[PDB]
Symmetry: C4
Subunit: 31 residues, 4 copies
Amino acid sequence: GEIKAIAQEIKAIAKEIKAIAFEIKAIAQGY
Amino acid sequence: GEIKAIAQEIKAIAKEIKAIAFEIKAIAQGY
Amino acid sequence: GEIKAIAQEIKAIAKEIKAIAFEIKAIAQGY
Amino acid sequence: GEIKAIAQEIKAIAKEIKAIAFEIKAIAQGY
């Protein structure tokens, strides 16, 4: 399941990105 | 799926990130 | 080649995201 | 690859985005 393992990692990174993006959005709005 | 399904979930998240990136960009420009 | 087509779309979106991210970074630094 | 290769290229780009997101976050916080 190599391709699934990589797809899994990608999905995990993508979720981190999305979380960081909302955090940046909040910082930007706050100032 | 399985890997099609995961690919579609990644694609959905990537679309969300892109949307939030555009929002951040507009907020950052406005200020 | 369904899975390749979706992987292709994902990669294209990811590149857009990365471009928008450098743009936001430049706006943030500029102010 | 092919789809493994594309998956690895997506993963690399996602890592770059995440890195730039952290940079943006730090810049935005600092100011």
